[PDB]
Write a protein that binds this DNA or RNA. Structure first.
Ligand SMILES: [Mg+2]
Ligand SMILES: [Mg+2]
Ligand SMILES: [Mg+2]
Ligand SMILES: [Mg+2]
Ligand SMILES: [Mg+2]
Ligand SMILES: [Mg+2]
Ligand SMILES: [Mg+2]
Ligand SMILES: [Mg+2]
Ligand SMILES: [Mg+2]
Ligand SMILES: [Mg+2]
Ligand SMILES: [Mg+2]
Ligand SMILES: [Mg+2]
Ligand SMILES: [Mg+2]
Ligand SMILES: [Mg+2]
Ligand SMILES: [Mg+2]
Ligand SMILES: [Mg+2]
Ligand SMILES: [Mg+2]
Ligand SMILES: [Mg+2]
Ligand SMILES: [Mg+2]
Ligand SMILES: [Mg+2]
Ligand SMILES: [Mg+2]
Ligand SMILES: [Mg+2]
Ligand SMILES: [Mg+2]
Ligand SMILES: [Mg+2]
Ligand SMILES: [Mg+2]
Ligand SMILES: [Mg+2]
Ligand SMILES: [Mg+2]
Ligand SMILES: [Mg+2]
Ligand SMILES: [Mg+2]
Ligand SMILES: [Mg+2]
Ligand SMILES: [Mg+2]
Ligand SMILES: [Mg+2]
Ligand SMILES: [Zn+2]
Lengths: 134, 158, 52, 122, 135, 86, 50
RNA sequence: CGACUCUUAGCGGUGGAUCACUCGGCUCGUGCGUCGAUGAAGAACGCAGCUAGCUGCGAGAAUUAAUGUGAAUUGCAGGACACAUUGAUCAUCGACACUUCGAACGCACUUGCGGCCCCGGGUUCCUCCCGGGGCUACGCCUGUCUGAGCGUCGCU
RNA sequence: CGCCGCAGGUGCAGAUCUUGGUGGUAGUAGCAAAUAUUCAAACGAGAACUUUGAAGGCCGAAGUGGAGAAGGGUUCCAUGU
RNA sequence: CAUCUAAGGCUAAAUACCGGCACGAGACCGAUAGUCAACAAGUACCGUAAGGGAAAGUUGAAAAGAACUUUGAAGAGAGAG
RNA sequence: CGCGACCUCAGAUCAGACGUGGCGACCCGCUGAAUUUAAGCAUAUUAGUCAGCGGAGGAGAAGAAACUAACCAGGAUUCCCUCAGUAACGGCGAGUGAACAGGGAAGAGCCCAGCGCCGAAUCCCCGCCCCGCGGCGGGGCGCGGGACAUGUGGCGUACGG
């Protein structure tokens, strides 16, 4: 279990940190697993969700194999919006349904200089971890 | 109001004692902090005895305790003179000195200077500059024989 | 806060309770009555080699 | 078309004040449009121009201050705003030199009777 | 001596506390002189004082003050101690010689009221109920 | 008449705002605040009112300077230094 | 009264400015919890401090 | 026959108990243990595109810079943002800035009025007006300058 | 939640008990100090009460008039609900 | 006879800590409880002032917060969703 | 009948510094009740406590014996256990009430004045030059000022020198 005396296991404290988390660590909290193909291509398991990458919902009313492109990362509400994941409200317009990023898998990653660097860092740390434990 | 037999009790609780109550819930924390400070201090004085300087052999004052012998504050100046140790060099080599204690008998005086001779024979004196040894000690005698002593230095026994 | 939360037990009694608890841990009826599923255990004072 | 402080720092006092004058004129026109209706594009440009003014002024003040520090470097008396602002108590302390100087008597004690390193056998 | 400052000498209470005259201050007049010198010169530190003369209505003392921030004091050890923040306003805490005499400090059988560092230090230790964890 | 009739006669203010502590306790005719005692150098403060002490104690306001002091203490009050530039 | 000091008039200005209803778009904010301006003041009902 | 009243139950009201929940307390413990004339604590007034309070901030005013991070903020709008002729947001915070009262400091205040030294303008340097900048509190130490005394002296 | 132990801020009808809610009273007492209103029209879903006009009255210049000081602090003034 | 050497001065450690900064924990309380304050709380409000001082948590997984039709001037309804 | 030396005083928006006010849980110096108990009540008790005033620091205060003891003697201060609800105080009523020795936590010692010796050996400020800015120091120079013989510094303090 947990042995660090400077890390809390208090339920009330942990919930306060989660709901009052600043934006830059809300980005870490709102991570998504990668697909099995990407988990093999890169040596990483999970990755913080991004604006323009393509996911598919794995839990809820919108389960399926349809690949939808993320269009909004609403960090304040801890949800993300995806392309065709939407419902028609009363007046006839369509609105997106908030989906927690932990319930999707990133099939394609919106790659830039920062993303490639993070993927290399996560993979390199994993390689060192399995090297130590080998 | 008294009720049948009993003691005449005089509790000293007439003076608002509740505003001065010492709890001891920090006693286990205080013992840990003391033990940590002891270990850190012993690490600070690396080969020197952890407990501290050598204390003299001292008889307890009153008629209740004069059959018993314990450790005193420091060796008197008369003890250091006949043992042949400077009263300012004694502190640097780990001997505690009490300048306000005087010897009244030669039995206690001689017992303490024999104690000083035992300590002086057991002392391993590192040279001040480890590269250049002047008069401290042989390299063999301090190569590994210099270990940090634990407990009181030559504990006083009855 | 000064409710006397702590109790002191005699050392001889604390050692007594250890001996009773160890002696009871060698009787299969007492361990089974704790519900410990010692049914295929080869021997109730179960001793393993020092490699563990 | 924004203003970045990084590219401001090479500029001189003359053009920095010219840029400040241009920004202030633009802000005054934006405040006019704010009270005369205008558009949301001009209303939202108010914050952009306001931060640009602060950016220019910060560059001007930082340049002047660091020039003053370079000017007063090595002089006995500096202006009070150029002196360290540690803490009132920390500024009343004895400095490092006089916290560490000793009497000739204490120097003689340490010369004659220095603390030794020793170990005692059991 | 100290006349009790009550209107018309009325000390509303039990007869034992009816005293107005013949009352005495717990600190000497030399300490009061040191306190008045220190308060006026708040930027200086009282060192000591001594008696220089008296008549029926006045006592005259001379108080030695030190400028803690003068360089002749700062650069000299054996007198740097007065410049430490813990030593400001000694005369208002009874740390000078005159002030200390009124606290009952001393060694041995005559001064058991101040074992602990002060009268209040002794009183707290003797009047605190040590409730251990195991009783 | 001590009741309703006499209440009509009150139109002259005893107290006004205080330029220190901002309370309406500044007695005009005595030129002294009844809450802080403004013309005195020291703030009026009494241990028989702990509730009043915690109404105006340190931390009940803004602490424009103290909140920066606590933040600067975590690095030892360094000055004249900058992070290593990129 | 008509005669007043600058400090009094500035004090009355702030009370006037903050005695206004809350915006309607505040109700649409996330985790709002605010229904209406609870610190509203009417001149006849509640008198100012001064 | 009805009304009315009483009892019981179904349904519906009024009310907000109970239960479940808990970004709050209370208690204990640990490590630090840091304010201020270089202007504190505290107070007032201000600052957002739409903003009243809370929160943040000070005319650079819900923030500037730097560094770390690395695509958001979001209630609506607008608008950047090649994310490598460099960057949204957030965090850190060492640079810069920090209105007026306040120990509060030119004098004074439920108002208001000076003085001195420089600078710019109307003057077209001389001192009137306007504006800007810096000073102008008390106590006290060291030194400096200017002094006082039928205080003690020397030369005269 | 049951059983074996442990520990309590552990059981309410009362205290002119504390806090909150709810009845009968009860559609009851009442909406009775300073003479007084009426007609027509307009707007309006709706008029004893608003607006206009016509009457009849009152304040009767020590006023129910016109202005101020103190105090209030936007109550001032338009538009709308 | 014993014992010290007053009327000058400095000095760390062990010790204290219901204020402060940052943490951890609990056989504690669970919205009339626990801080007065779980919430725009030392706030609203009261008093000339010193000072006194509250009440107030819960839609739902997601606002998907009821489009549209119909009676009414609207509040409010009936359908529908 | 002016000019100087000193003494004692004064002024300055003089050059450079320092104090003020806040917090105040803990700490130091004062001041200081009454409710209460005594089944009344005045001494006593509450209590050297609440309230009041002043002053600090991360701790404060204390502190290296004008000590304890009476022993085969111990040896600065502070804290814990115990001594001890004891010796003692007290309308000897109600009540109050330490210390030494012992065991531990920690442990650390010292500096002046005076008496003396040393050609004031001493210190501050101001300039000029160099080495560095981090808590402003070093080194060199000035027939540069001042302080100081009404006593600065070195040796040296009861453990003797
Ligand atoms: Mg000397
Ligand atoms: Mg009495
Ligand atoms: Mg009356
Ligand atoms: Mg009056
Ligand atoms: Mg009214
Ligand atoms: Mg019901
Ligand atoms: Mg920035
Ligand atoms: Mg006036
Ligand atoms: Mg003369
Ligand atoms: Mg109960
Ligand atoms: Mg009941
Ligand atoms: Mg009726
Ligand atoms: Mg009627
Ligand atoms: Mg008439
Ligand atoms: Mg009129
Ligand atoms: Mg009107
Ligand atoms: Mg409930
Ligand atoms: Mg509550
Ligand atoms: Mg209605
Ligand atoms: Mg000056
Ligand atoms: Mg003070
Ligand atoms: Mg009685
Ligand atoms: Mg009685
Ligand atoms: Mg009585
Ligand atoms: Mg008190
Ligand atoms: Mg001290
Ligand atoms: Mg001392
Ligand atoms: Mg001595
Ligand atoms: Mg006993
Ligand atoms: Mg007593
Ligand atoms: Mg020990
Ligand atoms: Mg000398
Ligand atoms: Zn005030």
């Amino acid at each position: 279990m947990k042995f660090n005396p400077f890390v809390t296991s208090d339920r009330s404290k942990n919930r306060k940190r989660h709901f009052n988390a600043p934006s830059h660590i809300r980005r870490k909290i709102m991570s998504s697993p990668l697909s099995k193909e990407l988990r093999q291509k890169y040596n990483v398991r999970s990755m913080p969700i991004r604006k323009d990458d393509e996911v598919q919902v794995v839990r809820g009313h919108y389960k399926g194999q349809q690949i939808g492109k993320v269009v909004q990362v609403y960090r304040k509400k801890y949800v993300i919006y995806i392309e065709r994941v939407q419902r028609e409200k009363a007046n006839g317009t369509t609105v997106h349904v908030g989906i927690h990023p932990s319930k999707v898998v990133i099939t394609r990653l919106k790659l830039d200089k920062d993303r490639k660097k993070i993927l290399e860092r996560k993979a390199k740390s994993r390689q060192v971890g399995k090297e130590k434990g080998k | 109001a008294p009720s049948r037999n009993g003691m005449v009790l005089k509790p000293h609780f007439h003076k608002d004692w509740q505003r001065r109550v010492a709890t001891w819930f920090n006693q286990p924390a205080r013992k840990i902090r003391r033990r940590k400070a002891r270990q850190a201090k012993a690490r600070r004085i690396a080969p020197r005895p952890a407990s501290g300087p050598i204390r003299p052999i001292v008889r307890c004052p009153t008629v209740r305790y004069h059959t018993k012998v314990r450790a005193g504050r420091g060796f008197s100046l008369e003890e250091l003179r006949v043992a042949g140790i400077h009263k300012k060099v004694a502190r640097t080599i780990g001997i505690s000195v009490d300048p306000r204690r005087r010897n009244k008998s030669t039995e206690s005086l001689q017992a303490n200077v024999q104690r000083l001779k035992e300590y002086r024979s057991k002392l391993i004196l590192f040279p001040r500059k480890p590269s250049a040894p002047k008069k401290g000690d042989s390299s063999a005698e301090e190569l590994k024989l210099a270990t940090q002593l634990t407990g009181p230095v030559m504990p006083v026994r009855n | 806060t000064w409710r006397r939360w702590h109790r002191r037990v005699n050392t001889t009694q604390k050692r007594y309770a250890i001996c009773s608890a160890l002696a009871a841990s060698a009787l299969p009826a007492l361990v089974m009555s704790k519900g410990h599923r010692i049914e295929e255990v080869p021997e109730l004072p179960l001793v393993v080699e020092d490699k563990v | 078309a924004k203003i970045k402080a990084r590219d401001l720092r090479g500029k001189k006092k003359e053009e920095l004040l010219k840029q400040l004058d241009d920004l202030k004129v633009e802000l005054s026109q934006l405040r006019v449009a704010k009270v005369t209706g205008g558009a949301a594009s001009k209303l939202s440009k108010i914050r952009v121009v306001r931060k640009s003014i602060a950016r220019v002024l910060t560059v001007i003040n930082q340049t002047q201050k660091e020039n003053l520090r370079k000017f007063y470097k090595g002089k006995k008396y500096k202006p009070l705003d150029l002196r360290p602002k540690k803490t009132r108590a920390m500024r009343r302390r004895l400095n490092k030199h006089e916290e560490n100087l000793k009497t000739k008597k204490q120097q003689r004690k340490e010369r004659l009777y220095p603390l030794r390193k020793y170990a005692v056998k059991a | 001596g100290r006349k009790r400052p009550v209107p018309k000498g009325a000390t509303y209470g039990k007869p034992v506390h009816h005293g107005v005259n013949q009352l005495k201050f717990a600190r000497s007049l030399q300490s009061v002189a040191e306190e008045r010198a220190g308060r006026h010169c708040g930027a200086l530190r009282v060192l000591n004082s001594y008696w220089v003369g008296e008549d029926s209505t006045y006592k005259f003392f001379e108080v030695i003050l030190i400028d803690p921030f003068h360089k002749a004091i700062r650069r000299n050890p054996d007198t740097q101690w007065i410049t430490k923040p813990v030593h400001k306003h000694r005369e208002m805490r009874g740390l000078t010689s005159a002030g200390r005499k009124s606290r009952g400090l001393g060694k041995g059988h005559k001064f058991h009221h101040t074992i602990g560092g002060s009268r209040r230090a002794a009183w707290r230790r003797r009047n605190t109920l040590q409730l251990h964890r195991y009783r | 008449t001590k009741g309703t009739s006499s209440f009509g006669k009150r139109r002259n203010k005893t107290h006004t705002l205080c330029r220190r502590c901002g309370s309406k306790a500044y007695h005009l005719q005595k030129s002294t605040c009844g809450k802080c005692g403004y013309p005195a150098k020291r703030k009026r403060k009494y241990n028989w009112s702990a509730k009043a002490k915690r109404r105006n104690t340190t931390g009940t306001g803004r602490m424009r300077h103290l909140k920066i002091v606590y933040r600067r203490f975590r690095h030892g009050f360094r000055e004249g230094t900058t992070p290593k530039p990129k | 009264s008509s005669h007043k000091t600058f400090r009094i008039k500035r004090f009355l200005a702030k009370k006037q400015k903050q005695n206004r209803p809350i915006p309607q778009w505040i109700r649409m904010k996330t985790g709002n919890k605010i229904r209406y301006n609870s610190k509203r003041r009417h001149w006849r009902r509640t008198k100012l401090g001064l």
